[PDB]
Amino acid sequence: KYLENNQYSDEGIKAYEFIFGEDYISSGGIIATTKILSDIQLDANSKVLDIGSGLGGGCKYINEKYGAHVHGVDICEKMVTIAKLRNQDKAKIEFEAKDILKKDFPESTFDMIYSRDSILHLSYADKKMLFEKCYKWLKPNGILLITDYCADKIENWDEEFKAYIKKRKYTLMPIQEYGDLIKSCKFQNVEAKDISDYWLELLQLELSKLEEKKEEFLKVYSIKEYNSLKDGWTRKIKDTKRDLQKWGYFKAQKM
Numbered sequence: 001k002y003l004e005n006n007q008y009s010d011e012g013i014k015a016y017e018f019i020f021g022e023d024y025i026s027s028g029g030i031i032a033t034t035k036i037l038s039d040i041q042l043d044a045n046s047k048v049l050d051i052g053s054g055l056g057g058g059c060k061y062i063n064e065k066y067g068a069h070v071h072g073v074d075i076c077e078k079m080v081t082i083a084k085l086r087n088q089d090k091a092k093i094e095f096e097a098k099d100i101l102k103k104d105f106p107e108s109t110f111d112m113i114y115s116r117d118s119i120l121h122l123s124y125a126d127k128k129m130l131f132e133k134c135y136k137w138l139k140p141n142g143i144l145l146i147t148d149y150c151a152d153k154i155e156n157w158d159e160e161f162k163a164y165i166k167k168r169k170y171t172l173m174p175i176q177e178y179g180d181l182i183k184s185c186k187f188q189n190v191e192a193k194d195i196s197d198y199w200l201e202l203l204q205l206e207l208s209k210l211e212e213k214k215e216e217f218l219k220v221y222s223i224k225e226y227n228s229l230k231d232g233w234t235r236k237i238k239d240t241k242r243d244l245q246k247w248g249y250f251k252a253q254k255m
């Protein structure tokens, strides 16, 4: 019976940047981004869409690494304003505040559509609608590259996990089911992989760095935000170990 700040509350966004690192508000920050993109091929003429672009870290990284044009879409105007402010000097990056479900792009626009821990905000029906849109928006041979939270079957959920999902308003499904949804939208070369052991390593590292810097955190943020972060990572670590909360990797191609 308490009022909990929502995930992207003013303080929540700042706290996520503290734990994930500057410009990022999802798993593994720049470290995971480097790894996820380590076999991805793009150049200065490539066009990339980032679905759920947040504070802009991913767009910044992709443009810096490849020189690619990057277009980030995020439903949160406040984040889009931040991303724009921080990347004014990058002419080939643009950000737009919109619900991706209300976006259209022409057929064959993007060499890559990229999304990191954002599609969890969408209902199953909306995920399907989005993947149908993504299929259209990709160029021939274009790549869809996603990480997203996934979960064990609902009957294996316990009380705390259910409370977490409700609070966050997430819609989480198992990895195979997510891959099958992508396949059903005609994507080919579909890879749907459980990378929860790598997620575990990132969670452990993130928490260890938070605890190391507790005094630093407490100079600017609340001890309630501190314990909320700490307890939240503690639960994610526990729940990934028993295969309840999962991290999914999905790569697919339009052929």
Ligand SMILES: C[S@@+](CC[C@H](N)C(=O)[O-])C[C@H]1O[C@@H](n2cnc3c(N)ncnc32)[C@H](O)[C@@H]1O
Binding pocket: 023, 024, 025, 026, 027, 051, 052, 053, 054, 055, 057, 058, 073, 074, 075, 076, 079, 098, 099, 100, 101, 115, 116, 117, 118, 119, 121
């Ligand atoms: C966990 S954050 C990750 C952001 C960024 N990809 C990152 O890794 O730092 C998920 C993002 O999804 C965005 N989002 C949620 N629903 C959306 C929608 N319908 N359209 C576009 N973005 C959405 C949120 O505003 C949030 O910034």
